[PDB]
């Protein structure tokens, strides 16, 4: 949980 | 979200969208696992409503989104309408989500977990972008 496959970009 | 930017497609896999039989998005929720969603009590979700996951561009028809049905709505009973205090309902899914590269679970903290002021966090959704 909480660790995406597609890393969010900030 | 007034003043946010577009997210990376499938970079927030736990985000779902609540839409009425009309297909109108009116609230957002979060996947805690492949059977239960978490959204706000005040949303007023009924079971004639559908959860949608894997969506990004609400307006694209070529997107492999998953339309999930609502089994039962669980309104925290500590929820206070007059205050909007304890504004948490749970959504029990009739039909299990299929986790994938774009559908996943968010982590809940310990009652114990601490998150101190001035800490940078993130909030996503399809709310109005202008008022």
């Amino acid at each position: 949980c909480g660790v995406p496959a597609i890393q969010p970009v900030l | 979200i007034v003043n946010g930017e577009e997210a990376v497609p499938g970079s927030w896999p736990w985000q779902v969208s609540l839409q009425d039989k009309t297909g109108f998005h009116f609230c957002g929720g979060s996947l805690i696992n492949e059977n239960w969603v978490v959204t706000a009590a005040h949303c007023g979700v009924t079971t004639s409503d559908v959860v949608v996951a894997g969506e990004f561009d609400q307006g694209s028809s070529s997107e492999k989104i998953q339309k999930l049905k609502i089994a039962k709505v669980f309104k925290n009973s500590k929820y206070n309408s007059l205050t909007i205090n304890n504004d948490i309902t749970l959504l029990k899914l009739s039909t299990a989500a299929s986790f994938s590269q774009t559908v996943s679970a968010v982590c809940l903290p310990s009652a114990s977990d601490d998150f101190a002021a001035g800490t940078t966090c993130v909030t996503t959704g399809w709310g109005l972008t202008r008022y």
């Binding site: - | 930017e5 577009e6 039962k72 925290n76 940078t120 008022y131």
Partner: protein, 95 residues
């Protein structure tokens, strides 16, 4: 509303500095954020507020309410997952 998903980073405040704004409307099961130039708004509700805790994104709050105008100055008011995880924890067992 917008067609595709938005996101915005924003600082969590203490409840107290929050009382500054909403005064006695802020309850113990509510936690503020925003007042940074970004603002949660109509249609955001029910949605996520995550913070990164040891590698993973954790459900730190639920987009609940705030400014009627979605003012990037008033902080938004979110559900405080920490005071409600115990009920969650429990509804699941049950069902």
């Amino acid at each position: 509303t917008p067609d595709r998903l938005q996101q915005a980073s924003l600082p969590l405040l203490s409840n107290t500095n929050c009382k500054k704004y909403w005064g006695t409307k802020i309850k113990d099961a509510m936690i503020c954020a925003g007042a940074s130039g970004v603002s949660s708004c109509m249609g955001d509700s029910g949605g996520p507020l995550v913070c990164k805790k040891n590698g993973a994104w954790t459900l730190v709050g639920i987009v609940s309410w705030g400014s009627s105008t979605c003012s990037t100055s008033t902080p938004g008011v979110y559900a405080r997952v920490t005071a409600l995880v115990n009920w969650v924890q429990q509804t699941l067992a049950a069902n």
